[PDB]
Amino acid sequence: YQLYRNTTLGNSLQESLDELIQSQQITPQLALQVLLQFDKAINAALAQRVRNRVNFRGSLNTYRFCDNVWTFVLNDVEFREVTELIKVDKVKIVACD
Amino acid sequence: SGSSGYKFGVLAKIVNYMKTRHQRGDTHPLTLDEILDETQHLDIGLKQKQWLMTEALVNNPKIEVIDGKYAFKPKYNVRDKKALLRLLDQHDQRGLGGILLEDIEEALPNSQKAVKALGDQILFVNR
Amino acid sequence: TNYKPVANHQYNIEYERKKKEDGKRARADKQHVLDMLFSAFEKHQYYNLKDLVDITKQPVVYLKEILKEIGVQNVKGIHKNTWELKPE
Amino acid sequence: TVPKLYRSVIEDVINDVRDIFLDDGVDEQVLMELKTLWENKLMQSRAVDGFHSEEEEEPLNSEDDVSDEEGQELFDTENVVVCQYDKIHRSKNKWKFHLKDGIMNLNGRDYIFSKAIGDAEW
Amino acid sequence: AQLKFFEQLDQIEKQRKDEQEREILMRAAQLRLKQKAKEMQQQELAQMRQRDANLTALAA
Amino acid sequence: IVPQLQNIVSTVNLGCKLDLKTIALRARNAEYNPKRFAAVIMRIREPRTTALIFSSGKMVCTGAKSEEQSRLAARKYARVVQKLGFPAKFLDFKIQNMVGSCDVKFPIRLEGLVLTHQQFSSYEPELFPGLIYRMIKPRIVLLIFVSGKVVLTGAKVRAEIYEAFENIYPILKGFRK
């Protein structure tokens, strides 16, 4: 899943690559191969990552489901994980199966 | 498995598209680079690009190629859906084996032409 | 000798497998199959309709239209509906 | 436990693409430039600390209205949550979400869950 | 151009001998074939990933 | 007792071919999953309704609790497609089925009804705890329970729901516990 490319981690990577492409320091096609490999590595890393059990709640707005991927947008929603609680009035949720 | 370049089906696909877009009334000679360009598949790799150009469009049966640009080989006559009075008056081969293989792929499924073809001398039958 | 089971155990296992996948898929950007179909057709000149189905989950009738659009079926000599890319 | 995962992933990815760079004809110096360029952007952003950084039948539309602003949905700074869904349920307007493996950024902070459960009315 | 096309004719004999050496170990009894099979297995997943990526791009 | 209508299933033809994928991506509150079903499910909050918008241009609207509410909700669903830009027409807003519910307010003996009315009434305890009294003169299927819930489903017009309940009221009054 080329899901995690538009994340801090993934975007900083693409930007770095574009520069190298720009300066012909680094070029495309190879860039695609890196994204494939970078994306595969991040997916494997996440699979061997794992975390902790939490508890939560929300209030709905838009939803979309295509390519087995759900994309929601909640308003006035606060989510608490373990001790920490985070308030929010606009949150976008992208979820793969 | 012999020699393979990039993704399989580039040939059986380039020819077919070229055929398709030409029938769609975009009629004009083109080159493999022009097809790549228009299909946004230019990044097929120079090696494959070259192998397609030199060989794929060379093993091509009777490729009608005046020079630079590849053209339509099977149908000698332009698919103009009209006026085959030359073949009707060609009374030297009993109608010249009018085949339907090169028909029904135009705007009117032979039928529209045939009705006028029915209206005219043109006669339709099937074996 | 005779018990009172409601849903036969074998039937319930089959029902669970069915609910997992539904064939009624959509068909947009239909040209991509041809990428996959030709893909396979280069490795072997011809493939039994069943082998092509094992790749395209779309309806056979509609798949046959896609197969008929870009190719022809040869008996190859032992029945076994088999499709091949046109040599032109 | 998050900067750690990122280091972990960056290391693995960098190590795993070295041969590809080499096969493509690339000096190992370029690889190091990548790592540097990459590590540096995060430090510049300052979202967290890193080890590297420290270094009628026709008038249908006549009624009008009824739909709200589509543009409200996108801010580009909106708290973005990436997660994996196990089961999404809907009864009338009652929705229940069963999520997993998620990275959240709420109010500016970063959080991670292995399993999330939520409720919302539409 | 054709000096390297005669070397490409020798590259055709390279693959000929690669197949010969494959059946050579077979007669004296496939890694390339296994690699090809693995590559073939990869493409369905690649198409699914590309569709997911397009949805994520448009979605966010 | 007056039965309350609480659902209208209606079909309205938009008149033109619609591309379903385009509608799903731009319309809000829309889900179009091809594998499970072949139509876009679209839901609006102001009048609680859900319209399955089909590709052939035929739209079915459900969940409305009165006749005027259903016509208005269908007019609003067609406004969505009009705004996106597909050519849009409104034709034949025809109600297909209306389900109504009421309480007789007295306990009823289902077993007795089956004894004197076996011809029109079918009751099996294991399958369905309610007796179904399919009625021929006004075509309606009424599901009756011991509590007293007369559940009339299958009336194309408002009058039929009321007429059937008045017709079945004497039979229940006779078997009143």
Q: D1-43: which CATH number, 2.40.50.140, 1.10.287.100, 1.20.1270.360, 2.30.110.10?
A: 1.10.287.100
Query: In 3-state terms, what secondary structure has residue F32?
Result: coil
Question: Would you list the domain boundaries of chain B?
Answer: 8-79, 80-127
Is the Cβ of A26 closer than 8 Å to some Cβ of chain D?
yes
B12 with C86: CB under 8 angstroms? yes
List phi, psi (to 5°) of A79: -120, 130
| Best CA proximity match to A36, nearest among D17, D3, B89 | D17
Is the Cβ of F24 closer than 8 Å to some Cβ of chain A?
yes
Kindly provide the b/e burial profile for residues B35-65, where b requires at least 16 CB atoms within 10 angstroms of the residue's own CB: bbeebebeebeeebbebbeeebbeebeeeee
* F61 Cβ neighbours under 8 A, 6+ residues apart: F8, F9, F10, F11, F12, F49, F50, F51, F70, F73, F74, F77
| DSSP state, residue C45 | S
Query: In 3-state terms, what secondary structure has residue D36?
Result: helix
Q: How far apart are CA C10 and CA C15, in angstroms?
A: 9
- Measured in angstroms, the CA of A72 and the nearest CA of chain F are apart by 10
Tell whether F75 and F152 lie within a shared domain: no
Q: How far apart are CA C73 and CA C64, in angstroms?
A: 9
Start and end residues for every CATH 2.30.18.10 domain found in chain A = 52-97
Residue D90: both structure tokens together: 């809907």
Tell whether F27 and F79 lie within a shared domain: yes
CATH of domain A52-97: 2.30.18.10
Query: In 3-state terms, what secondary structure has residue F38?
Result: coil
The length of chain A is 97
A82 with D112: CB under 8 angstroms? no
Provide the sign of the torsion angle of the four alpha carbons E15, E17, E21, E27, taken in this order. positive
Query: In 3-state terms, what secondary structure has residue C72?
Result: strand
- Measured in angstroms, the CA of E35 and the nearest CA of chain A are apart by 17
Residue C28: both structure tokens together: 């947009």
Q: C-alpha dihedral over F145, F149, F152, F157, to 10 degrees?
A: 170
Q: Which domain holds residue F138?
A: 1-9+96-177
Query: Do F37 and C24 make contact, defined as CB atoms within 8 angstroms?
Result: yes
Query: Do B1 and E36 make contact, defined as CB atoms within 8 angstroms?
Result: yes
Q: How far apart are CA F172 and CA F128, in angstroms?
A: 19
Residue B80: both structure tokens together: 């103009």
**Contacts within 8 Å (CB) and 24+ apart, B62-67:** B66/B29
**Contacts within 8 Å (CB) and 24+ apart, A73-82:** A73/D73, A73/D78, A74/D120, A77/D120, A79/D104, A79/D106, A79/D116, A79/D118, A80/A54, A80/A55, A80/A56, A81/A54, A81/A55, A81/A56, A81/D104, A81/D111, A81/D112, A81/D113, A82/A52, A82/A54
Sheet of strand C71-74, all strands in order from the earlier edge strand to the far edge: C46-48, C82-85, C71-74
Q: Which CATH superfamily is domain A1-51 in?
A: Transcription factor IIA gamma subunit, alpha-helical domain (1.10.287.190)
Q: How far apart are CA F19 and CA A49, in angstroms?
A: 42
E strand segments, chain D: 79-91, 94-106, 109-121
* B8 Cβ neighbours under 8 A, 6+ residues apart: C38, C39, C40, C41, C42, C43
* Residue type for position F96: Q
Query: In 3-state terms, what secondary structure has residue D97?
Result: strand
Angle between helices E31-59 and C31-43 (to 10 degrees): 170
Tell whether F40 and F90 lie within a shared domain: yes
- Measured in angstroms, the CA of F148 and the nearest CA of chain D are apart by 26
CATH of the domain at F33: 3.30.310.10
List phi, psi (to 5°) of E59: -65, -45
- Measured in angstroms, the CA of B62 and the nearest CA of chain C are apart by 9
Specify the experimental method: cryo-EM
Beta F4-13 vs F30-31: how paired, if at all? unpaired
Domain end (from F95, F125, F141) = F95
Phi-psi region of A29 (alpha: psi -120 to 50; beta: other; left: phi over 0): left
Give the number of domains in chain F.
2
Residue C60: both structure tokens together: 């056979």
Cβ within 8 Å of A, F 47-76 = none
Cβ within 8 Å of D, A 29-88 = 30, 33-34, 37-38, 41-42, 44-46, 49-62, 70, 73-74, 77, 79, 81, 84, 86-88
Beta A90-96 vs D79-91: how paired, if at all? parallel
Instruction: Dump the DSSP string for B42-69.
Output: -TT-HHHHHHIIIIITTSSTT---SSSS
Tell whether F155 and F82 lie within a shared domain: no
Query: Do D57 and F90 make contact, defined as CB atoms within 8 angstroms?
Result: yes
E44 interaction partners in chain C (CB closer than 8 Å): 36
Ordered by where they begin, the domains of chain C are: 22-84 (1.10.10.10)
Residue F112: both structure tokens together: 């007795």
